[PDB]
Symmetry: D4
Subunit: 150 residues, 8 copies
């Protein structure tokens, strides 16, 4: 990757429906070169794909939660817990972090009941779980994971 | 929105570069109808946009952090702190949550130094900040915010 | 339910011994209509019943406690713990909450000894209990659960 | 108060619409005596009143919260904070407790937004508040404050 | 007990070697009456005994500790843990408290090593112990348990 | 101090009303020598005094508390807070400890109200107090501060 | 050891490559005496050895961590855990401390991955480990363990 | 640096008094080459110096402490606090860490009093200090900071 690729990415991260002609004009380079570079980037796996950004509200995803999960130590309990957490419907993010040396789980649901039946009940039944603490998100000030280049 | 729109969205959330002809075939509907519905969805704001999914590693974003920030109570300190946190370069997520009744901030950087100079030093200088606790992410088990329909 | 029912409820929540004639006069409607609506409300279960508000002091309920209980994860331990907690004499409130993802138990007793023998000893013997933390209430600034309409 | 008064209270705490004739029959005493005793109890303030028990769901009170509030020490900050908390619409319970030596606040709202605008924003603006931690109630296993005699 | 007994106790709590003649003079009562009352108090168990107040430093008791111990719930673990803690040489105080709903243990030793071998190693070997947290006392601002009447 | 003095102290710590003749017989030494040594010990300050051990219950000291107090840092706030805490009526013990690097305060009162008016209200008014956490003692398994030699 | 030995040590702790002639001149004593004393010190074990102070950065030791480890109580679990922690490659410091009554482990690694594979995975597999909390060091303000005499 | 330099360092980190002839023999290289490389390493700053390893006990450094210090946010308070902490006599280590986002301070003293007068009193007087928590080290299982190559 070079300076050029960055500018391309800085644009595609925001809007992938920006016609080549428009991008070519902005960064001032041959449309055929651009097309080539974009292919290169995908080939190499820099650009892993293109997604539609859907508004969660539009799907009535009102119950937003961030849960910290502490795992029981020993055997392979840790790694196993992470994967079990990542497959729960509604969970889009699972991170293993230092500090509380545990998992941080991001999930979304339409209501409390859905949350309870799909997430909580499942979680409370997992043996490797020592403890879980759920923080209800009451306001999303910002959520732009797509923005990787500032 | 109806059952049909969902199926369309369930596909566009994963891959927006799926030609209409291919989608039309999968959900079995006229390509012109599909195109219409997709336009409708954008018009109404269900689909807010299309992004390129860029691999963070490809940009050497190695220092991943999740920080909890407690704000000083009173005046308008809270709301103000959230916005100041959302404009720090590298920060893609800011949530106000219950429980610790504070902010959860998601950010990414290439290194510790970058993290320190761009995020920490800035944060430690904000007056409204009572306390901040940063959790270093050592492993991303899953990060698919794009998946809103399971 | 309509605007009218609300006004009726806003009155019955405070004082259920308010003669129909008096209520009819306040909200200005036929006493027979009122009587009908009140019946409707009970029928439908909006009004689940009428109680006598007894002063706890009058019964020497001096030892007031609020206990947080953490449950051991797995099996059905959680749901089971809640019900065991709800049947302890003296306990009038059991809530399963997020954050500490545990139970909050409200209870009243005449003395420390009663508290110990009826609540604590029972609680400490429950297997599913991981930990319990009791907060002694030294002052009730307000306790009006009956007020549902402000 | 004597053994008799207790039996009367043990009944009125559950259902105050139980005709004198029915109560008189249960406890086996003259209806005129009963009526006298009940008056005595009210006179003396044992029975402070009769309320209608309204189902919160019936009023769409879905967002149930239990908040711990720590106050800034000094002056009269403490006592003042308690009263300010007790007058927030939606708050039915305020207790000053030992342990975390702070306040426990019980409140109910129809939604998150209502909760935010009526409770949180108000609370975050109170100067005497050092910190507040809100626990969202996801399940009410039991709530019978009316039951004072077991 | 009456007003007189109090004055007697308020003196004996400070200095038990105060001749009857001196006390009799201070509270102005017959020495024979005093002697009688003091006997009464012992008889009834108000005065459980007379001790020599020994300076801990004089015995090189330099390592002063206050330890909080959390017990594993269930069976009779709790009560059993308390008694095991009360028999450890060096431990003069064991309290079961609310809040952290655990034990607070007061002990004294001449050195760190003594502390380790007599207290810690013993404690760490007790099964019923979930966790222990020792707070080293660096300064005794006041220690007058003998003063019960202010 | 020598081996002999210890044996003397090991006895006087338990019961100071043990006639010289009895002690002389137990440790097998001349009564005049004993009397001399005891004087020496007092002279040198090993034995600081003799107290009457009064049963707290006998004085209706039912509300027993152990409070942790965190002080605001800076100036001389710390040392000042300790002394203010040591002069509150009912407080018999004040320790400055490491770990939570704060104060541990032991106090006794007859009731909750007394506790509130004499201890809490006073404490909450002290400026240097950052935070206080009171643990109610529900059971004294052991309290023998007089025993310094095991 | 005497005043002289101290001055010698105060120099050797900083720079052991300081020729005898130079030291002899600084402390003003016969070079043969100095040489003798230094030998004495080693003989007696005051000086346990001489090391080369290597800059960690020079070895790309970028991932610096400080981990608190809580051990499961009972048997000999504690002592055993300490030794297992002290033999993990990268760990240069293991301390058993009071307060959290646990272990504090100091370690260094070149990267996150190394840290994970050599330290974390090993630690998470140890049975006696109740919980571990890793604090990432982002800045070393000072690290001069060699300085024992100020 | 190359493979050779490592072997040299792996030896000098343990014992710097190992004659060149001995090292030359172990790693099998010309003594003149070795001498050259060692000079290179110092020149480049890989080897920053040679120290005498002094046994702390030999200096009666019995009171070993590890203190966590939280700083007040804002201005330049943080950076300033670190430097003030690094200049306190007895302090050999100051680290700024994530998690509790604070300072970890390592210090040694001969006694509690020294600790109090030199470290604590100084620390409690620093304004930028929000809170400090000292953990007394009761056992050093391992302390070999000199070992950088395993
Ligand atoms: N720069 C452009 O947009 C087009 C350049 C050139 N004609 C090409 O398409 O290869
Ligand atoms: N279903 C299709 O793919 C095409 C249908 C129809 N010929 C249209 O394009 O409107
Ligand atoms: N409004 C009243 O109080 C009475 C109205 C009418 N006479 C009725 O009883 O039905
Ligand atoms: N016991 C009753 O119900 C009635 C008793 C008696 N006739 C009265 O009313 O005074
Ligand atoms: N008051 C005294 O000291 C002595 C009173 C009286 N002579 C008695 O001893 O009984
Ligand atoms: N040993 C005793 O009790 C008395 C010894 C000796 N006659 C004395 O009193 O000095
Ligand atoms: N003081 C010195 O440096 C040397 C003293 C004396 N000539 C010796 O070497 O023993
Ligand atoms: N290898 C050695 O120890 C010595 C090698 C060679 N004679 C030199 O000193 O340069
Ligand atoms: Mg995207
Ligand atoms: Mg009611
Ligand atoms: Mg005494
Ligand atoms: Mg060294």
């Amino acid at each position: 990757m070079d300076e050029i690729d960055l500018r391309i990415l800085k644009i595609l991260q925001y809007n992938a429906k920006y016609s080549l002609d428009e991008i070519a004009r902005e960064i001032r380079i041959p449309k055929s070169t651009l097309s080539y570079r974009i292919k290169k980037l995908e080939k190499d796996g820099v650009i892993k794909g293109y997604y539609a950004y859907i508004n969660p509200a539009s799907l009535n995803l009102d119950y937003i939660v961030i849960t910290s999960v502490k795992a029981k130590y020993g055997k392979n309990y840790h790694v196993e817990l992470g994967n079990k957490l990542a497959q729960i419907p509604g969970v889009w993010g699972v991170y293993f972090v230092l500090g509380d040396n545990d998992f941080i789980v991001m999930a979304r649901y339409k209501t409390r009941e859905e949350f309870m039946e799909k997430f909580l009940e499942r979680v409370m039944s997992i043996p490797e779980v020592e403890r879980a603490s759920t923080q209800v998100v009451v306001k999303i000030i910002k959520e732009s994971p797509n923005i990787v280049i500032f």
